[PDB]
Write a protein that binds this DNA or RNA. Structure first.
Length: 205
RNA sequence: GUUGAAACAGGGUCAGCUUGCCGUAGGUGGCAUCGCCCUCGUC
């Protein structure tokens, strides 16, 4: 297990229901935490899996109505012109957030030759301690980074000490087992928060 | 290296065109520097 602390100023764990108005999730998405761990280090052999999220900063909603685009790019239209495809997508961002995601990893079917668990574990530990990453972690959206810092146990205070509020079904991690190399078609299996006592745990598939 | 990616607050708008702080009004009634004092004792 790795107790990697994710911290940042603003966040945007955009809910699947409110994508037109990017209302952020109450806490960090387990799928977002797995994506962060993969952007720090990943390979066609290592399969990241989130185990437990421990909140370290109170939930603070901040509405930032951003102006987005609503039409994708392709080989057809050589240009976009946002003056004809403007989208005033709201974004209830999460100001001042901090989470120490306890998570580990397994092995995929295409592990290859170098399928050593200890090798990938040490590589992830070095990348988290020195500050190396394949891609900058994002707090639900790439417009917000993550001041990550690998913790050995606990090096920060948490506000949710007693029994708090349950956030219901949140997006655990989309099912990409039915997807070919480079995902395309997927599903959406979700899970309950159980109870945000101090550090909510995830239910592995 | 197969897992949210792309995202405008805008192009831009004289806060004025203006309006007498005045019309206007006694520091006044009026009150003794006084009631008083050897330039001396005198060489």
């Amino acid at each position: 297990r790795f107790i990697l602390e994710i911290s940042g100023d603003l966040a945007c764990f955009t809910r699947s229901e409110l994508k037109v108005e990017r209302v952020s999730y109450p806490v960090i998405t387990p799928s977002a935490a797995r994506n962060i761990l993969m952007a720090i280090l990943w390979k066609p052999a290592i399969r990241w899996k989130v185990l437990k999220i421990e909140i370290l900063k109170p939930i603070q909603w901040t509405n930032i109505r951003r102006n987005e685009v609503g039409t994708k790019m392709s080989e057809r239209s050589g240009s976009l012109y946002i003056e004809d495809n403007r989208q005033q997508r709201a974004s209830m961002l999460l100001k001042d957030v901090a989470y120490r995601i306890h998570a580990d990893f397994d092995m995929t079917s295409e592990a290859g030759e170098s399928d050593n668990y200890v090798k990938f574990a040490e590589m992830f530990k070095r990348r988290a301690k020195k500050g190396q990453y394949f891609h900058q972690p994002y707090l639900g959206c790439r417009e917000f980074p993550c001041d990550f810092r690998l913790l050995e146990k606990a090096e920060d205070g948490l506000p949710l000490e007693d029994i708090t509020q349950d956030f219901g079904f949140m997006l655990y991690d989309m099912d990409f087992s039915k997807s070919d190399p480079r995902d395309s078609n997927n599903a959406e299996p979700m899970f309950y928060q159980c109870k945000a006592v101090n550090g909510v745990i995830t239910v592995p598939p």
